[PDB]
């Protein structure tokens, strides 16, 4: 029953490390299921959930974009921000969601849109992942 | 004069690939000059210029943070955005700088200042690096 060593790193350092059966992530190209033996690969990740499977139990992590690196003996997710499901502050993410929506409807604006949309997506992603704890 | 392979990749894909005598970058910890034989290292990068020294000649790349991944033989810069100095659209970056400055100067409510400050740093860095083409 083979496993892959996975590490999730943010600019603050490692947030998660384990040996798991499968790592599923959303790359810019599509959903990827990384199993032991996967060829080496470096792919950009979208604001999405990473799903880490170990003996049927699945651990969810909100990844606010970053990069996936797959090597023979390791899988690394390098994320601009990452939170395990159980560590997401749901109130804060709801507040963030509503703030982005308010900006996006601003009209009276020096409001930046592209970044306001990304702010909304990071909040919705965190809320979706938190539902899984 | 030993070399290290350098790769710079962004969510659009590779920006640069070559063998250089040294790569210098601004990590969260401070400036790093990476020579061949450097031990493994993952470090987050600041909004900065990467200086790639080759045959006396130096190539500059504007890097909008992301991560540095070092092995004795090869250095990967995984950037949220990166532009070789000669590829920087100066008119664009100046407009971004002035747009961010207008946003920052606004005493109006939820403009979102943190990411306005980051937008300004990115434009200033690009304008500075373009000068090094
Ligand atoms: N609601 C959440 N629960 C736990 N930590 C979070 C949450 N939202 C952001 N963080 C953390 O705060 C730091 C900044 O993250 P980021 O810049 O993506 O926040 P943001 O989308 O601007 O949200 P906010 O406006 O709520 O601060 C990162 O360390 C991140 O892991
Ligand atoms: N002035 C520049 N010249 C060439 N490409 C650039 C420049 N500014 C951003 N880009 C490119 O556009 C894409 C988005 O980059 P980024 O999100 O950092 O832009 P930005 O800071 O929002 O700037 P702008 O407001 O001008 O779009 C990245 O591919 C990047 O390489």
Swiss-Prot record, chains A, B:
InterPro entries: ATP_F1_dsu/esu_C_sf, ATP_synth_F1_dsu/esu, ATP_synth_F1_dsu/esu_N, ATP_synth_F1_esu_C, ATPsynth_dsu/esu_N
Major localization class: membrane
Top-level taxon of origin: Bacteria
Subcellular location: Cell membrane
Keyword field: ATP synthesis, Cell membrane, CF(1), Hydrogen ion transport, Ion transport, Membrane, Transport
Family indicated by similarity: Belongs to the ATPase epsilon chain family.
Role this protein plays: Produces ATP from ADP in the presence of a proton gradient across the membrane.
Protein name (database record): ATP synthase epsilon chain
Organism: Bacillus sp. (strain PS3)
